[PDB]
Amino acid sequence: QLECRSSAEQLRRNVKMVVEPLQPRTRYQCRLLL
Amino acid sequence: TLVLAPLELLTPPRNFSVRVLSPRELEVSWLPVYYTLHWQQEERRLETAGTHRLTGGYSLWVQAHSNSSERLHVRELPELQLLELGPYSLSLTWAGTPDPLGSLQLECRSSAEQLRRNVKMVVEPLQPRTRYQCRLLLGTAEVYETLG
Ligand SMILES: *[C@@H]1O[C@H](CO)[C@@H](O)[C@H](O)[C@H]1NC(C)=O
Ligand SMILES: *[C@@H]1O[C@H](CO)[C@@H](O)[C@H](O)[C@H]1NC(C)=O
């Protein structure tokens, strides 16, 4: 899985991977979880 | 004379704490013999001290066997009501008990995405015409379909 956490939202996507939707001009820390 | 067999004879609970995890689930934690945990609404035998989970106003005490510790007094969530249904957002509301919680979050999981929002709460952005099961984490899950 790929987890992208921002200051207001956190999205985990089951898995290359496309994370959508995301907020514009927002920083997110993304990591891979096995 | 005759020397006989030398015989061995064997003769509180340090800082017991209670954490409210869920509406039927409490987390007990105590340090140092067995222990007896008593919980009364306003006993369970354990072999070792540490952390345990009590399932199912409450005064709790732990006895080390024999003295006991101090009695700690501690304190169901409502279902999710849809306040606003949109194509890219969902505003939901719940009353809840008036108690302070360290964590209170709303989790909405769809077939392709899962979003957890730190908490009424508005979940945005969401996919249009997508069904998501939303629940409260400190609960029951409610399925809601977004607009198109
Ligand atoms: C049990 O605990 C209390 C409080 O710590 C203490 O005063 C008491 O001496 C203990 N009892 C025994 C028999 O050691
Ligand atoms: C446990 O440790 C000390 C011992 O007095 C106390 O001050 C503290 O509040 C206790 N912690 C919890 C979580 O009960």
Swiss-Prot record, chain A:
Localisation per UniProt entry: Cell membrane
Coiled-coil ranges per UniProt: none
Subunit structure: May form a complex with drk and Sos. Binds the phosphotyrosine interaction domain (PID) of Dab.
Role played: Receptor for an extracellular signal required to instruct a cell to differentiate into an R7 photoreceptor. The ligand for sev is the boss (bride of sevenless) protein on the surface of the neighboring R8 cell.
Entry comment, domain topic: It is unclear whether the potential membrane spanning region near the N-terminus is present as a transmembrane domain in the native protein or serves as a cleaved signal sequence.
Family named by the database record: Belongs to the protein kinase superfamily. Tyr protein kinase family. Insulin receptor subfamily.
Protein name according to UniProt: Protein sevenless
The species this protein was found in: Drosophila melanogaster
Lineage start: Eukaryota, Metazoa, Ecdysozoa, Arthropoda, Hexapoda
From Swiss-Prot, chain B:
Localisation per UniProt entry: Cell membrane
Stretches assigned to the Fibronectin type-III domain: 12-76, 77-146
Domain of life of the native organism: Eukaryota
Annotated glycosylation sites: N15, N67
Protein family according to the UniProt entry: Belongs to the protein kinase superfamily. Tyr protein kinase family. Insulin receptor subfamily.
Physiological role: Receptor for an extracellular signal required to instruct a cell to differentiate into an R7 photoreceptor. The ligand for sev is the boss (bride of sevenless) protein on the surface of the neighboring R8 cell.
Subunit structure, interactors included: May form a complex with drk and Sos. Binds the phosphotyrosine interaction domain (PID) of Dab.
Entry note about domains: It is unclear whether the potential membrane spanning region near the N-terminus is present as a transmembrane domain in the native protein or serves as a cleaved signal sequence.
Annotated protein name in UniProt: Protein sevenless
Organism name: Drosophila melanogaster
Parent sequence residues shown: 1784 to 1990 of 2554
